[PDB]
Design a protein around this ligand. Structure first.
Ligand SMILES: N[C@@H](Cc1ccc(O)c([N+](=O)[O-])c1)C(=O)O
Ligand SMILES: N[C@@H](Cc1ccc(O)c([N+](=O)[O-])c1)C(=O)O
Ligand SMILES: N[C@@H](Cc1ccc(O)c([N+](=O)[O-])c1)C(=O)O
Ligand SMILES: N[C@@H](Cc1ccc(O)c([N+](=O)[O-])c1)C(=O)O
Ligand code: NA
Ligand code: NA
Lengths: 310, 310
């Protein structure tokens, strides 16, 4: 499995593969990702940090942008409190094993030269395009604010100012990234990770929607969250439990079952798991049990590293 | 005529009179106005500079903002060229007799503290309100840009950052000023001057609509412009020639006429002129002739001061 294929594993799209292949030849190459700081760090975050680790193992210098200023524009509170949550997020990401450079957006996003280019980009970006780019990111607001259309330009200029080779994010970011590729003289390679479904199956996993597993949830919390989750027999699309099996579990995987329900089942790949589940050969309750227990084990070192701090 | 009434003369509104009366008691008081730099300086500009002179004679420190950065946001070109036109505008205003402090917006509008407050205001300003405030200011654009909604916040923060007591502008500015009075902790007194009608009577006088008299137009140019202008007998509303008589001419005024059309007519006030014109006792052609000749004389020292430079 080449470095390209390691990077591509479990991504939704790379814009573009040819461009990534050219970046991979260089000795010095940088990848970055920004996060609005979040009170809880969940599996959606972890999926993305795992992708940054892949890039790091492929020789990329990694930068994690603690996006305090964009969080501010997106109505998450006061900068000082946002920054505090940002420092906590850094600790969690470090507990996930990511050794990287962490920078607050506001360290550079208020520089006169940054601002002037934001205003320069504002002349080239229609209100219509800016709002469309924010549809999956902007806080719900019946009276949308000017801040909502500043946010995407801020993000677009961020890739430019810092000179990054590769930008990583969830698929929600793809319209802002498309805008950046259209407006900036250097085209940034964009790696988009899938958006995980919330545990109740009704929307996307989100720290503000209460439908997530946090990386530091207790084992009994993880078990109860998964026990309650949407997981219809034979359906994989929009099935959060199957997504967790796909994106976080190591294979081969042994699903423990009572003898009276078939006894223990060993699954050599997610793909085999998907066949078993689609064929209603594997029952939701047994899938849930295996997913819960293997997820607890995967998250335990993170939870424990954070616990050692207390 | 008290200082208050001198200031109020020929204004469309003061927001608010009580607030202005309190400002007038202070020893130290500042008034400012911003202009997007303009290739030609016209009677609309002059009307506003005349109002600033009134404020100066009432003891106000006067600041003229050469609004290079807002002009940039409003698609008037590159900053360097905008700034050059700004320096020309300063010379014209000086030739009008205005001794004041001239500052380019960009000297302070890119400071980190300015920018942060712009983003702070962007959180409090809806897109809907921002666009409505720009309806009479924004360049025509079938695909409105993010820059259009940054502009009004920029202007709102300008009154705050510099600590001005009084903001002056045309009535086109009144929604931005209303926004500033709602959002800022110190309420700025707003003096709004009337918007002059264009010479063809179809819209407002504008340096981009070719419907203006420039302060440095030649006498034959002024004569031809006025000769062609909309000026229907007995109609004053939307009559640019009557507006020029109201806002620029000194009274008493002697309208020269051939004996066969009544001979010379002396008019002691604009109000008397309006009666004569409404009663179709004064013919458009004779009004035009007097307005043209008296306007030439009023503008001559300006034209001549600018000519001396060549
Ligand atoms: N939009 C990202 C945060 C983000 C990503 C990348 C960025 O460059 C910036 N930024 O500029 O502040 C911000 C999110 O939804 O969490
Ligand atoms: N508000 C949109 C986009 C969005 C999704 C999830 C979120 O957590 C946030 N947010 O809080 O910024 C925003 C929605 O509900 O789909
Ligand atoms: N809006 C004014 C220009 C202006 C007036 C006042 C101001 O404070 C600023 N500004 O902030 O740049 C700009 C015009 O239409 O010409
Ligand atoms: N574009 C609007 C507002 C406007 C009026 C006059 C103007 O000169 C400009 N302009 O050029 O910025 C803009 C209109 O035509 O009414
Ligand atoms: Na080498
Ligand atoms: Na005194």
């Amino acid at each position: 499995m080449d470095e390209f294929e390691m990077i591509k594993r479990n991504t939704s799209e790379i814009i573009s593969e040819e461009e990534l292949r050219e970046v991979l030849k260089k000795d010095e190459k940088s990848a970055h990702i920004g996060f609005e700081p979040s009170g809880k760090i969940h599996l959606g975050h972890y999926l993305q940090i795992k992708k940054m680790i892949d890039l790091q193992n492929a020789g990329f210098d990694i930068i994690i942008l603690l996006a305090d200023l964009c969080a501010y524009l997106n109505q998450k509170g006061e900068l000082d409190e946002i920054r505090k949550i940002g420092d906590y997020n850094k600790k969690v990401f470090e507990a996930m094993g990511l050794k990287a450079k962490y920078v607050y957006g506001s360290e550079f996003q208020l520089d006169k030269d940054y601002t002037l280019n934001v205003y320069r980009l504002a002349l080239k970006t229609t209100l219509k395009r800016a709002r469309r780019s924010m549809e999956l990111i902007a806080r719900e607001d019946e009276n949308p604010k000017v801040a909502e259309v500043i946010y995407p330009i801020m993000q677009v200029n961020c890739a430019h100012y810092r000179g990054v080779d590769v930008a990583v994010g969830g698929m929600e970011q793809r319209k802002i990234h498309m805008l950046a590729r259209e407006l900036l003289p250097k085209k940034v390679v964009c790696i988009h990770n899938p958006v995980l479904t919330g545990l109740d199956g009704e929307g996307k996993m989100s720290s503000s929607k209460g439908n997530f597993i946090a990386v530091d949830d207790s084992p009994e919390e993880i078990r109860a969250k998964i026990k309650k989750a949407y997981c219809p027999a034979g359906v994989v699309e929009g099935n959060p439990i199957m997504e967790i099996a796909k994106y976080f579990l190591e294979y081969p995987l042994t699903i423990k079952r009572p003898e009276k329900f078939g006894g223990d089942l060993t699954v050599n790949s997610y793909e085999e798991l998907e066949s078993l589940f689609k064929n209603k050969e594997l029952h939701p309750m047994d899938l849930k049990n295996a997913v819960a227990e293997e997820l607890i084990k995967i998250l335990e070192p993170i939870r424990k590293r954070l616990l050692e701090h207390h």
